[PDB]
């Protein structure tokens, strides 16, 4: 349940949020194989409830109607060949399943969703699934408002409805089956593993139970034996009293306390210092580095702080995203999932933006296709954060130093740090407002090494800054801290 | 037995114990939630209050102000205050169910409806009193700046062991998906016990 | 910036960080040094005091009252009240020394001899006042049952970022061998801080 | 430096407080080493200064004027042949070792010392060692006064003068060099340890220098190459600066919070109950337990309770004291130091008690002998402790469970408690105001034992209670509240 299941050596999986069956295809073959990425998490591609009021938000996919693999994303023999060609080229693909409910139980009745399947949310009516009114937890919950009314009671965040959703009777095995039949199909298919969505709403046990009756993947491109790869969904800063822990048993945890402390860290915001960072990981009360899923941001964090005064780092700021990103590539901490997002307009009613429900880039609601620019850029408002050089190198340099120790770090008492991996790769940062002039000790073979976050080593030279590493391992860093990305990175395969 | 009274104009993290998102702002302000959503953040003075004095049964009486403002973004979904021993007993404005309600042990022993509207993104002064006399609890909620009010009273029996010492603060719940950004500030608090 | 109060007439640990051979008895007394010798016992009030305010500079008044009883069974051995940041400023009453002391930063700014035998065993009313307007830093020590009293003030500049937080308390010193057996009581504890 | 010396087997030392040498050789022949005692700790050999007002205090005895063997508990001809007939026996001697400071600075310039010796406590004119004011601490004290102003400042309990005594230059190799010719001189005898007096005030790096200089104990008792047993006075209730593990490297440290804990423990105050102590020791943020000397009270801390209000455990209150020290003897933590002591006349004035300088039971200053009573008890206002039979009966315990792991632990959830160690000893206890009658499990092999706590096993039978244990280890208890001894324990030895 811990093992990503990615082919030999590569180490991270990109979340291309919202994007199409069809695109994710072809991005694939033309890059994601490539340049060494793990996998992919998709968007929930079973099919949803159609959100009008908004028009067709983003959260609309997760209020599930029925399992028929049918949504804005594509079809069954679009998802299918996606899969396949994928799998075929060795990267993975990892599906967000929506299992704690299905849609909100003020949902109009009708055929009001992506695939045209009737429902009933009043009657809690769902017979394409089927699912009856005894197959949701209205009768167990304890609140008046049938409800979560407190998240420090346990029994009211697991049995009682998340913001309105009905929630699915998971210990009964009818329900257990019906989730375990959508979960084995899709691993037939070819599926890694899964993202469980909203698992703090379900009991360890009761997710634990339909994980035992997954099958083992596909032997066509996985070992016999290989269980799917699990990453739980679960919000724990630590002020309440479901605890991440509770879930270990089933697979990894994403860990939010990661991209929260790395954010205010990277700002220099409360008095804290990227030196500080020398004990990153289970030093600052983070879960154990094997049970963790980490990143710097995820679709629904990245929203909702155009006003500031957030410290979560998103593709908005740049250049101190980068800077958190390649941190975090670079530390031999959890496992890495990259994001890849649409950007969307932020505009401000009386102090609060109201564009966080936009969805993906779309013509009348038909999402827009990723079109590639010359400079492999992204359009069509497509960001492709996994694109940019530098993030793009790091997950390669990630796939190089696997394995390889947390080394030789460095640092100036206040923003300046540096740390290498065994002896396959080095990395120096400078955050502080003065140029960085130091000679280091990075632990690698002599030789000229390009730094592959201001260029790439092509042919016989590189194409930004060259770092000469000494006989003896130390080598001459200057860093400005007006350059464009204070930071430089150079590996065993980036030498010369 | 201990008497204690505190105010603060403007935040600082050195008498705060702070559970999840919870952070103090450069300008002072009390910010819960900002970086997080489906989970909860807490915010308590650093000393424990006494409620009740167990050497005589005495319970104490309570008054306390606070300058809040929330902000929507479009308790299950809300901004609490809360009183928990060392059976906790909580105001909730619940921005989700849009109620204030009058918590003792997730029982809510009184509740009044109320236009989240009417304070969305605006200071909202609060005002909650517990007189141990006539046992009566009463919350006072205003939008200053356009004149709006809600109240609600209703009678909270604390003489009970469980309430002789308790944690005072508050409690910032955000909820998922579409109600994942609601934000929560705290720019002011007064508070004052009495037997 | 937070100001606070606090009345205690009878202890109670919940509200107190102790240290060493510091206790809270059956009848709510705070007792010191009662079972050990040649160490240091502290007790602190649970939350930080903000003398100084950073954001604007501006230093704090305080005053605060409390009732001891030494008992000597005849600091270096004897009873300080403490400011300890979160540099320490004390009031000593060494009992070894036969002086009262305004120390800071272990350095004696000023200090008077004081006759432990008038207060020997009996209850002793201390008060202790800072104003930070005069810079004055008095200390009023009285037998209310004798008419005795010992007093001695001076300028204390606390207008330092060390001061900002401190922790405010007791600490109770016992000596070796023939001085090993003075116990240190208090009885009741009020304090007040003002901006 | 942590291993006591002891002979074969014996686990237990102890302090025959200001015993003369010629009682205390007495008793090792008749009782302590048939008995199975491990050792003695004897008050300051070294002539000390006479204190006439108060009285002789027994304090005096803590204010050297030189290391001349010459004493009110005898010369230095009493002083070896006590360490021989005891060694003789297989009963070891640890000395109190005074090196910290002499006399008092206030101390009259003249011969009025225990062996006649001349001194100028004035002037630090200490001829008789010799010691001048050279060498001692007044020009490094920092404090305006010379003495200790601050327990918060290391330098000043180190440096200045504790309670007016002069200060004795640690640092400096002559100094150095005198206190360690005085306690090789006492090695050679045939002492086995000592007991460091006051060693918070002296730094851990001089402590070591002196220890360094010290010869291998006397071959003729001791196997080659044995390094004297260290345990230093150190009293750290965590409440400042000094520290017990910084004098870790040096040897034992006596661990002060074990008997203020205890005491609470037994006296039920503050909320505590026996079923607490299941997990007794480091559980209770103790030191290590192979770096401790424990004891429920010491010579210092079981005077200036008349007033009450004081957890501390002593003779004074013999049934809770001899349920505590049984707990202590028969727990495997830490190294046990059984207190001896004599009664003086608790008188109080206006709510004081003004005897505790009071000195040991004299005629006109000489102090009497030690006088057995034919029940095996003392006269002459000596307590015997350690001839009570409860007590007595427990160290033997100690011996015969040596290195057997605490096990079968056993409680009501409030005051009755119970537990064994290994197969060779087991011990039930009974503190709450209720009978106690219930059948555990004792680990012990099936057979009838004597309760050594309330008779002994003489011949063929018991001569109090008698503990009859099945084939499965078993037995049937029955403690009454009412009892005078409140608790049963069995061993090995006392099975019939
Ligand atoms: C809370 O108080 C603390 C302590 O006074 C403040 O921290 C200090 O701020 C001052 C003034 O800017 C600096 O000179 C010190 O270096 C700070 N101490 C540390 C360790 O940072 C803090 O600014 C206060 N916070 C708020 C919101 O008022
Ligand atoms: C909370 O604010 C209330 C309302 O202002 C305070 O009650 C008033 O105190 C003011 C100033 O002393 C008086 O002029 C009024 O007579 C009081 N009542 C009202 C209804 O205004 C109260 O003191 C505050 N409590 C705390 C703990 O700060
Ligand atoms: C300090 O307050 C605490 C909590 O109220 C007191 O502990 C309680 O005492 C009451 C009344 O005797 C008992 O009913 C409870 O069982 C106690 N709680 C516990 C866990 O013991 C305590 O007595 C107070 N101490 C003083 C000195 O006033
Ligand atoms: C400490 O006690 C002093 C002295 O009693 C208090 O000062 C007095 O307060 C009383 C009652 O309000 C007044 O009648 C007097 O005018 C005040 N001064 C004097 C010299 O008596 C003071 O309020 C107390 N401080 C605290 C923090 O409890
Ligand atoms: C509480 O109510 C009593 C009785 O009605 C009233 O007399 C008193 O003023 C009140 N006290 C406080 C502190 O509100
Ligand atoms: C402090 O001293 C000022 C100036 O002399 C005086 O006016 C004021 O009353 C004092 N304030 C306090 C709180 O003692
Ligand atoms: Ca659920
Ligand atoms: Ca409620
Ligand atoms: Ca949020
Ligand atoms: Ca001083
Ligand atoms: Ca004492
Ligand atoms: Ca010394
Ligand atoms: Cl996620
Ligand atoms: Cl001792």
Request: net charge negative; with cysteine; proline share 3%.
């Given at each position: 349940?811990?093992?990503?299941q ?65 949504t ?28 704690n ?80 039949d959508?979960?084995?199909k ?25 994980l ?8 066509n ?20 009293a ?14 939010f ?20 960072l020398?004990?990153?990981?289970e ?6 580095s ?75 609601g ?79 073979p ?30 001459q860093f ?8 204070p ?10 | ?12 993290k ?53 300058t ?18 060392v ?43 517990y ?65």
């Open positions: 349940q811990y093992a990503p990615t082919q030999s050596g590569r180490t991270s999986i990109v979340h291309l949020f919202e994007w199409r069956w069809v695109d994710i295809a072809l991005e694939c073959e033309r890059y994601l194989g490539p340049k060494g990425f793990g996998g992919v998490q998709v968007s929930p591609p079973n099919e949803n409830v159609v959100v009008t009021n908004p028009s067709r938000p983003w959260w609309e996919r997760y209020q599930p109607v029925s399992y028929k693999l049918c804005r994303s594509g079809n069954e023999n679009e998802f299918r060949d996606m899969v396949t060609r994928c799998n075929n080229v060795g990267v993975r693909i990892y599906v967000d399943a929506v299992i409910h299905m849609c909100g139980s003020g949902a109009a009745a009708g055929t009001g969703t992506t695939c045209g399947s009737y429902c009933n949310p009043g009657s809690r009516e769902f017979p394409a699934v089927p699912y009856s009114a005894w197959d949701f937890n209205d009768g167990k919950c304890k609140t008046a408002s049938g409800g979560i009314e407190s998240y420090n009671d346990p029994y009211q965040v697991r049995d009682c409805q998340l913001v309105g959703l009905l929630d699915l009777a998971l210990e009964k095995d009818y329900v257990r089956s019906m989730i375990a959508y979960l084995n899709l691993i037939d298919i070819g599926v890694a593993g899964f993202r469980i969505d909203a698992s703090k709403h379900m009991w360890p046990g009761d997710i634990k139970a339909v035992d009756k997954l099958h083992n993947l596909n032997t491109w996985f070992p016999a034996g290989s269980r799917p790869f699990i990453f739980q969904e679960v919000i724990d800063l630590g002020g309440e479901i605890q991440s822990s509770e879930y270990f048993g089933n697979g990894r945890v994403t860990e306390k990661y991209g929260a402390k790395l954010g205010t860290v990277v700002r220099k915001w409360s008095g804290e210092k990227m030196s500080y020398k004990n990153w990981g030093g600052w009360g983070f879960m154990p094997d049970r963790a899923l980490v990143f710097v941001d995820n679709h629904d964090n990245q929203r909702g702080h155009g006003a500031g005064g957030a410290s979560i780092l998103t593709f908005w700021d740049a250049r101190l995203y980068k800077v958190a990103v390649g941190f975090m590539l670079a530390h031999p901490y959890g496992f890495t999932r990259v994001m890849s997002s649409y950007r969307w307009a932020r505009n401000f009613v009386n102090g609060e933006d109201v564009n966080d429900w936009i969805g993906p880039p779309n013509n009348n038909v999402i827009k296709e990723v079109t590639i620019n010359a400079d492999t850029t992204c359009g069509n408002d497509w960001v492709c954060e996994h694109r940019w050089r530098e993030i793009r190198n790091m997950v390669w340099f990630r796939n190089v130093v696997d394995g390889q120790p947390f080394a030789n770090w460095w640092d100036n008492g206040s923003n300046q740090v540096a740390f290498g991996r065994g002896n396959r790769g080095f990395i120096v940062f400078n955050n502080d407002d003065w140029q960085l002039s130091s000679t280091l000790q990075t632990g690698l002599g030789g000229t090494y390009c730094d592959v976050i201001s260029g790439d080593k092509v042919g016989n030279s590189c194409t930004g800054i060259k770092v000469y590493v000494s006989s003896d391992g130390t080598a200057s860093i400005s801290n007006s350059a464009e990305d930071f430089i990175a150079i590996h065993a395969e980036s030498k010369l | 037995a201990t008497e204690t009274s505190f105010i603060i104009d403007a935040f600082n050195t008498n705060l114990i702070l559970q999840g998102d919870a952070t103090v702002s450069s300008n002072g302000n009390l910010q819960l939630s900002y970086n997080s959503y489906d989970s909860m953040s807490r915010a308590f003075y650093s000393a424990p209050i006494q409620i009740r004095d167990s050497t005589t049964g005495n319970v104490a009486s309570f008054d306390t102000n606070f809040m403002n929330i902000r929507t973004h479009r308790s299950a979904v809300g901004l609490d205050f809360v009183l928990v021993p059976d906790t007993v909580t105001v909730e404005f619940d921005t989700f169910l849009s109620r204030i309600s009058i918590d003792v042990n997730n029982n809510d022993i009184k509740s009044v409806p109320w236009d989240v509207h009417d304070y969305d993104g605006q200071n909202a002064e609060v005002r909650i009193t007189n141990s006399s006539t046992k009566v609890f009463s919350v006072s909620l205003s939008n200053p700046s356009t004149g709006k009010s809600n109240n609600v009273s209703t009678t909270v029996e604390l003489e009970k062991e469980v309430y002789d010492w308790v944690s005072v603060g508050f409690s910032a719940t955000s909820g998922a998906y579409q109600w994942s950004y609601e934000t929560h500030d705290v720019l002011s608090w007064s508070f004052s016990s009495k037997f």
